[PDB]
DNA sequence: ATCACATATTGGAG
DNA sequence: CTCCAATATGTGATATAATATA
């Protein structure tokens, strides 16, 4: 009837976590498979940063491979600097033609309003 | 209308 | 007469909103 979501939260852990071992097929990876979420506000409406990731990853799963590649960069841990995390996140997400023209086109197909 | 951190007060033993 | 550990209590920091126009 319904698929099953990839990305699940838990309130009272304040956690949200992105099954990585279900799509990779890697039962190690189970480890990495959550995310840690420290600011109250963004720890507010947390049900919708869920909703809309899996949204995003149900329409395309290159995120995936995103995600998974910006975690193992944070694994790494050795001379991880800002810079470098801010190279990582904006070749991966911010350069990444696919993934801004998949949202544009998710905004443009249920827009309902003329201003 | 919480929450993470600081503090005086109780519990306990040595 | 100190030292330990923990409890309940205090204090700062943060968080709330969805009818547009010099």
Redesign the pocket.
Known sequence: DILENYVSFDEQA?DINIAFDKLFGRDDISHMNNFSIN???????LD?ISDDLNLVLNKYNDLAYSLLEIRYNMATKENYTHMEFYSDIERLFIKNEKLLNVISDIVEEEYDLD?
Do not use: A, P
């Open positions: 304040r600011k109250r506000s963004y720890y507010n409406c919708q201003l």
